[PDB]
Design an enzyme around this catalytic site. Sequence first.
Site, short mmCIF file in Angstrom:
data_model
loop_
_atom_site.label_atom_id
_atom_site.label_comp_id
_atom_site.label_asym_id
_atom_site.label_seq_id
_atom_site.Cartn_x
_atom_site.Cartn_y
_atom_site.Cartn_z
N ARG A 180 65.89 31.13 -59.08
CA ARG A 180 65.50 32.32 -59.64
C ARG A 180 64.02 32.73 -59.57
O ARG A 180 63.38 31.63 -60.04
CB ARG A 180 65.96 32.08 -61.08
CG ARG A 180 65.85 33.26 -61.89
CD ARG A 180 66.21 34.53 -61.54
NE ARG A 180 66.15 35.62 -62.78
CZ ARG A 180 65.05 36.53 -62.84
NH1 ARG A 180 64.13 36.34 -62.30
NH2 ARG A 180 65.46 37.55 -63.83
N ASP B 74 61.74 40.43 -63.09
CA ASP B 74 62.86 40.74 -63.36
C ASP B 74 63.09 42.05 -62.61
O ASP B 74 62.44 42.99 -62.87
CB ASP B 74 63.13 41.35 -64.89
CG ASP B 74 64.11 40.28 -65.68
OD1 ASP B 74 63.44 39.40 -66.26
OD2 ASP B 74 65.16 40.54 -65.65
N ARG C 82 69.82 27.09 -61.62
CA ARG C 82 68.87 27.78 -60.74
C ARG C 82 67.31 26.89 -60.91
O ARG C 82 66.89 27.14 -61.67
CB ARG C 82 68.87 29.13 -60.90
CG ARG C 82 70.35 29.72 -60.74
CD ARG C 82 70.16 31.13 -61.16
NE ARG C 82 69.79 31.71 -62.51
CZ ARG C 82 69.43 32.73 -62.87
NH1 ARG C 82 69.78 33.56 -61.98
NH2 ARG C 82 68.89 33.12 -64.00
N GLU D 196 69.10 45.13 -61.17
CA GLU D 196 70.41 44.47 -60.13
C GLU D 196 71.29 45.29 -59.43
O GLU D 196 71.26 46.56 -60.11
CB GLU D 196 71.28 43.85 -61.63
CG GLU D 196 71.21 42.24 -61.92
CD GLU D 196 69.70 42.15 -62.30
OE1 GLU D 196 69.42 41.37 -63.19
OE2 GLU D 196 68.85 41.92 -61.16
N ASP E 147 65.77 39.08 -57.20
CA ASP E 147 64.85 38.05 -57.79
C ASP E 147 65.97 36.74 -57.67
O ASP E 147 65.27 35.66 -58.23
CB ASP E 147 64.58 38.38 -59.16
CG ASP E 147 65.93 38.52 -59.83
OD1 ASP E 147 65.83 39.51 -61.22
OD2 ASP E 147 67.21 38.20 -59.80
#
Length: 135
Positions: A29, A34, A81, A37, A15
């Site tokens: 971003r 979401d 971002r 990660e 993302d």
Amino acid sequence: LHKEPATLIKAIDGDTVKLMYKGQPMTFRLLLVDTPETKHPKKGVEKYGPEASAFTKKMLENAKKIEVEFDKGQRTDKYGRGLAYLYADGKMVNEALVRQGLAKVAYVYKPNNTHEQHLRKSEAQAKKEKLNIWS
């Protein structure tokens, strides 16, 4: 809302991507989503993290044209971002990730929520199809 052109510099993870926008290098971003990660020291690589990053990377690396779409709220977060909807050849990267079960719809924050319904429908379908994160 209006689309503006940009050029891929580097995809960082599912993302977060580094683009060239109005002559400057900038980190963006993805709004309202979401992805898992691959980064964090406390975390590591969560499940589907690598999948999500390769999807974002491939989609952008293979595009004829990339466009950024700012929403109606603030355009940068506290980390500097840019906050946006990314389009690859006219397809919203943010929706594609959600439609494939590679991302959850984020905690939304008025008034940066213009595509919220749209994404929520794709999320429901992905859950129904029990895809990836929803498996």
